[PDB]
Amino acid sequence: AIIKEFMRFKVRMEGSVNGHEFEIEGEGEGRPYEGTQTAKLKVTKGGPLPFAWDILTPNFSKAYVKHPADIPDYLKLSFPEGFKWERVMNFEDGGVVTVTQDSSLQDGEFIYKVKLRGTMFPSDGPVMQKKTMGWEASSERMYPEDGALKGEIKMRLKLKDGGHYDAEVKTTYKAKKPVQLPGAYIVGIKLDITSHNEDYTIVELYERAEGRHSTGGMDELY
C-alpha cells in the first residue's frame, strides 16, 4: 500500500478574504484508516489575519476519513495520482468562500495546494469582527453524480455570545483517474483548533472523520 497507516501531508493555501491577501503553509500527520489527523499551520504572508480563522480551517484532507469495508473509499483509491475538489461555502449573512484544491502524493507524503477566495462578508459581521468560537460537529451527506463524489453540509459556527452562524457548504471531489464511487452515505466530522498563538499566526488543528450509512435523511432529516 501507498496510503500507509501513518501518513504526513504538506499544505500551502493562497487566499484572500474581503480583498485581504494571505498565504499559509502547514504540515500535518495522521492515520488515514482511523479517521484522525492533526495539522500545524503558519501564516507566511498577510498576517495577522483581519478575519476569523474558523472560515479557513475546513479547507485544511479527505484521504483521512475512516470508511467501513462496505463503503468504497473513493478518495483513497484515487492515489497515487490523487484528486481535486472544489467547494462553495454560502454563509447566512451573504459571505461567500469558494475553494479549489489539488491533492497529490509526492515522495510518500500528501501534498495539498489550496486556493481560497472569501467575499461579501459584512464588515460588522462575526467573520470580520472575529466573534467565532469553532465549528460544531458536522454531517457531510455524500452522493455520486456525474463521475464525481458530491458532499453537502450545513455547518454551524459557534458564536462567542451564543447561538450559531451557519453556512451551506457544497463540495465536489473528483479523482484524477476513474476509480470506484460509493453510494450515498454520511461522513461524521469534528474539527477543533487545539492551540493558537495570540495573533493566530500559528494554529494547530485536530480532525476526526468517519463514514457511516445514512438512515435515510440527506437534506433536513439526516
CA 141 to CA 120: how far, in whole Å? 27
CB-based contacts of 104, cutoff 8 Å, min separation 6: 81, 82, 110, 111
Cis bond upstream, residue 182 (ω within 30):
no
Alpha helices in the chain (DSSP H): 74-77
* Three-class DSSP category at 93: coil
Q: Which three cell numbers stand for residue 154?
A: 450545513
CB–CB of 3/76 below 8 Å? yes
CA 150 to CA 166: how far, in whole Å? 20
Q: How many helices (H) and strands (E) does the chain have?
A: 1, 12
Residues paired with 29 in a beta bridge:
8, 38
Q: What is the CA radius of gyration of the chain?
A: 17
CA 73 to CA 11: how far, in whole Å? 22
CA 162 to CA 168: how far, in whole Å? 20
Report the structure determination method. Answer: X-ray
CB–CB of 2/80 below 8 Å? yes
CB–CB of 99/114 below 8 Å? yes
Q: Which three cell numbers stand for residue 102?
A: 489539488
Q: What is the CATH number of the domain that holds 73?
A: 2.40.155.10
CB–CB of 186/140 below 8 Å? yes
Q: How many folded domains does the chain comprise? A: 1
Q: Which three cell numbers stand for residue 168?
A: 451551506
181-199 as b/e: b if 16+ CB within 10 A: bbeebbbbbebebeeeeee
DSSP letters for 33-58? TTTEEEEEEEEEESPSPSS-GGGTGG
Neighbour-count burial of 90, counting CB atoms closer than 10 A to its CB (0-12 exposed, 13-18 middle, 19+ buried): middle
CA 80 to CA 76: how far, in whole Å? 9
Range(s) of the domain holding residue 50? 1-222
Q: What is the dihedral of CA 151, 130, 114, 24, to 10 degrees?
A: -150
* Three-class DSSP category at 210: strand
